[PDB]
Every structure is written in C-alpha cells, then in structure tokens.
Amino acid sequence: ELSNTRLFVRPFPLDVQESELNEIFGPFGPMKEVKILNGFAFVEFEEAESAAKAIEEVHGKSFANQPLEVVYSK
C-alpha cells in the first residue's frame, strides 16, 4: 500500500513552503522532489531509506506551535 519514495506531511501555515521542507527534511537524504500545497504537503526522497527514516523521524515533531505528522504517501 505504501510507496518506495514519497512522504505525505500535514498542512502547514502561511509558512508552507519548500524552504522549511528542505531545512527540515534536509538532514535525511537527497530529496528527489518536494511539494507544498495549502492543505497538505509531500516529499519524495531519492532514496527509499531516507524516506522510510524521515517518515519515522519527522512524524511526531513540532512546527508552528503544532505537532507535525508525516507518513508514507500512497
């Protein structure tokens, strides 16, 4: 059901941009691509490992005075 390289993030505030995604998901691996839309976010790593990790790393983090959430984007 899950993917090899794709992590779905929660909806970010007015600061919803790739800038934060890179500064956050940066220390994980070579992000093949990134997507930021008002309501939901997505990040595709160039390495399954980097993604599988970021999913268990970013998930449960904090940002914008709110609990972050990331999972394996279908």
Short mmCIF file of C-alpha atoms in Angstrom, two decimals:
data_model
loop_
_atom_site.label_atom_id
_atom_site.label_comp_id
_atom_site.label_asym_id
_atom_site.label_seq_id
_atom_site.Cartn_x
_atom_site.Cartn_y
_atom_site.Cartn_z
CA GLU A 1 0.00 0.00 0.00
CA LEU A 2 2.88 2.34 0.82
CA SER A 3 5.37 3.75 -1.69
CA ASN A 4 9.14 3.45 -2.07
CA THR A 5 9.87 7.19 -2.13
CA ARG A 6 7.08 9.52 -1.01
CA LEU A 7 6.15 11.05 2.35
CA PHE A 8 2.91 12.94 2.97
CA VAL A 9 3.11 15.78 5.51
CA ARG A 10 0.38 17.71 7.31
CA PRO A 11 -0.95 21.14 6.28
CA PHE A 12 1.48 23.94 7.12
CA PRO A 13 0.59 27.57 7.98
CA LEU A 14 1.38 30.67 5.93
CA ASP A 15 4.97 29.44 6.17
CA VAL A 16 4.05 26.47 3.97
CA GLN A 17 6.99 26.45 1.55
CA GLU A 18 9.84 24.25 0.34
CA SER A 19 12.21 26.37 2.42
CA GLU A 20 11.06 24.73 5.66
CA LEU A 21 10.69 21.33 3.99
CA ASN A 22 14.34 21.46 2.92
CA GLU A 23 15.56 22.86 6.25
CA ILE A 24 13.59 20.11 7.98
CA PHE A 25 13.80 17.09 5.68
CA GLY A 26 17.26 18.26 4.65
CA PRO A 27 19.22 16.22 7.21
CA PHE A 28 17.80 12.94 5.90
CA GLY A 29 18.88 12.44 2.30
CA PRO A 30 18.84 13.69 -1.31
CA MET A 31 15.22 14.78 -1.69
CA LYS A 32 14.32 13.83 -5.26
CA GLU A 33 11.43 16.30 -5.15
CA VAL A 34 9.11 18.26 -2.85
CA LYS A 35 5.53 19.52 -2.93
CA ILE A 36 3.80 22.11 -0.75
CA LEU A 37 0.09 22.86 -1.15
CA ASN A 38 -2.31 24.77 1.10
CA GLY A 39 -3.87 21.84 2.94
CA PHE A 40 -1.27 19.11 2.51
CA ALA A 41 2.44 18.57 1.85
CA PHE A 42 4.50 15.89 0.10
CA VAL A 43 8.18 14.95 -0.15
CA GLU A 44 9.80 12.37 -2.43
CA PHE A 45 13.30 11.29 -1.42
CA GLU A 46 15.81 9.95 -3.95
CA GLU A 47 16.39 7.03 -1.58
CA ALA A 48 13.81 4.69 -0.06
CA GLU A 49 15.91 4.54 3.11
CA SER A 50 15.98 8.32 3.53
CA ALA A 51 12.20 8.37 3.09
CA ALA A 52 11.45 5.44 5.40
CA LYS A 53 13.55 7.22 8.03
CA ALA A 54 12.14 10.72 7.60
CA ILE A 55 8.70 9.15 7.99
CA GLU A 56 9.61 7.82 11.43
CA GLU A 57 11.71 10.89 12.23
CA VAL A 58 9.64 13.89 11.14
CA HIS A 59 6.47 12.17 12.35
CA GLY A 60 5.79 13.39 15.87
CA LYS A 61 7.90 16.52 15.52
CA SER A 62 6.95 20.13 16.27
CA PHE A 63 6.47 23.12 13.97
CA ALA A 64 4.47 26.36 14.01
CA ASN A 65 3.43 25.68 17.61
CA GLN A 66 1.76 22.49 16.40
CA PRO A 67 2.54 18.74 16.25
CA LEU A 68 3.80 17.65 12.83
CA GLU A 69 2.78 14.43 11.10
CA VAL A 70 4.34 12.50 8.21
CA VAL A 71 3.51 9.15 6.61
CA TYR A 72 4.24 7.05 3.53
CA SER A 73 2.41 8.93 0.77
CA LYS A 74 0.40 6.47 -1.32
#
